[PDB]
């Protein structure tokens, strides 16, 4: 009992398929008695740019600004901007982080990329040492819930788009695994725009049904073999 979930949500439109997937997650996890928080990035006008405004007070080397170094140092000295530390608190408290987003150029929308760039700073999400299996968010679960324009068929190994697992690598391995997350199997809702109403409802139902047993899941082996291998 007592699980905490953060949903990081990146869609402009409440009535969208993404919005529906987010709301189903909120309702079902809430029904289960979980603690639920939603970071609605567009509604928050979330800042995507990594800039020197992300550090308050004086820099550790204001002659040559290195964002990575400066945010590492600011994290240690508790002088990060409040929009960042607000998100870090939600992540720190969460047992599971769900990312809900439409696929933009085989990746996350820029507003969500900005969340990953700015929130997951050195000292908070990883360090030397402490990355991949020993990343600082170890013990936490992460799950990518992505919607696509392309159909399942268009996303095969030999297809024009390649296997969907190919585009997952930078997100699941390079970002989430790197920070110590155990990665649950992605939820891929293929081509809702093209799908019939029945097919759309079926995809929503699949998600809702999955959420009923999400705490019983095993994480994937987040390896190059899982992503590219046979």
Ligand X SMILES: CC[n+]1c(-c2ccccc2)c2cc(N)ccc2c2ccc(N)cc21
Ligand Y SMILES: Cc1cc2nc3c(=O)[nH]c(=O)nc-3n(C[C@H](O)[C@H](O)[C@H](O)COP(=O)(O)OP(=O)(O)OC[C@H]3O[C@@H](n4cnc5c(N)ncnc54)[C@H](O)[C@@H]3O)c2cc1C
Which residues belong to the annotated binding site? Answer: 11, 17-20, 103-106, 126-128, 147-150, 155, 173, 177, 193, 200, 222
Residues counted in the chain = 230
DSSP 222: -
Q: Which residue has the tokens 């004086």?
A: 58
Which of 39, 23, 21 shows the shortest CA–CA distance to 31?
23
Instruction: State the Cα–Cα distance between residues 210 and 25, nearest whole angstrom.
Output: 10
What's the min distance (Å) between Cβ of 179 and Zn ion?
11
DSSP annotation of 174 reads I
Q: Whose CA is closest to 172, among 136, 219, 207?
A: 219
Q: Measure CA 225 to chain center.
A: 22
Shortest approach of ligand X to residue 39 CB, angstroms?
19
Binding residues for FAD are 11, 17-20, 103-106, 147-150, 155, 193, 200
- What is the C-alpha to C-alpha distance for residues 51 and 48, in angstroms, rounded to an integer? 9
- Buried/exposed code over 171-193 (b: 16+ C-beta within 10 A; e: otherwise): bbbebbbbbbbbbbebbbbbbbe
Stretch that binds ligand Y, among 17-25, 92-100, 127-135, 209-217 (CB under 6 A): 17-25
Is the distance from CB of 84 to CB of 119 less than 8 angstroms?
A: yes
Pick from 9, 17, 46, 126 the residue near ligand Y by CB under 6 A.
17
Q: Which of 15, 58, 197, 216 binds its own copies (CB under 8 A)?
A: 15
**Shortest spacing between CB 30 and its own copies, in angstroms:** 25
> Of residues 117, 126, 180, 227, which one binds ligand Y by CB under 6 A?
117
Q: Which does 111 bind (CB under 5 to 8 A by kind): ligand Y, Zn ion, its own copies, none?
A: its own copies
Q: After which residues is the chain broken (C to N over 2.5 A)?
A: none
How far is residue 122's CA from residue 71's CA, in Å, rounded to a whole number? 7
Two tokens, residue 34: 């979980």
Residues at the interface with ligand X (CB under 6 A) = 68-69, 71-72, 105, 121-122, 128, 149-151, 154, 161, 174, 178, 193-194
Shortest CB 29 distance to its own copies, Å: 25
CB of 217 to ligand X, least distance (A): 25
Interface residue with Zn ion among 3, 4, 173, 210 (CB under 5 A) is: 173
Residues that bind its own copies (CB under 8 A): 12-13, 15-16, 42, 45, 48-52, 63-68, 104-111, 113-114, 116-118, 120, 132, 149, 157-158, 160-162, 166-167, 169-171, 173-175, 178, 193, 224, 227-228
């Amino acid at each position: 009992a007592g699980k905490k979930v953060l949903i990081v949500y990146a869609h402009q439109e409440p009535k969208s398929f993404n919005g529906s997937l987010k709301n189903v997650a909120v309702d079902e996890l809430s029904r289960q008695g979980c603690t639920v928080t939603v970071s609605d990035l567009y509604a928050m006008n979330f800042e995507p740019r990594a800039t020197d405004k992300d550090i308050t007070g004086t820099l550790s080397n204001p002659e040559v600004f290195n964002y990575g170094v400066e945010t590492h140092e600011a994290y240690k000295q508790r002088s990060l901007a409040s929009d960042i530390t607000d998100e870090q608190k939600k992540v720190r408290e969460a047992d599971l982080v769900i990312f809900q987003f439409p696929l933009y150029w085989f990746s996350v929308p820029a507003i969500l990329k900005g969340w990953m760039d700015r929130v997951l700073c050195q000292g908070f999400a990883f360090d030397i040492p402490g990355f991949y299996d020993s990343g600082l968010l170890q013990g936490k679960l992460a799950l990518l819930s992505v919607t696509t324009g392309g159909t399942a068929e268009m996303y095969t190994k030999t297809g024009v788009n390649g296997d969907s697992r190919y585009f997952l690598w930078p997100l699941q391995h390079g970002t989430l695994h790197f920070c110590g997350f155990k990665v649950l199997a992605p939820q891929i809702s293929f081509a809702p725009e093209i799908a019939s109403e029945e097919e759309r409802k079926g995809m929503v139902a699949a998600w809702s049904q999955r959420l009923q047993t999400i705490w019983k899941e095993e994480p994937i082996p987040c390896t190059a073999h899982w992503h590219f291998g046979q």
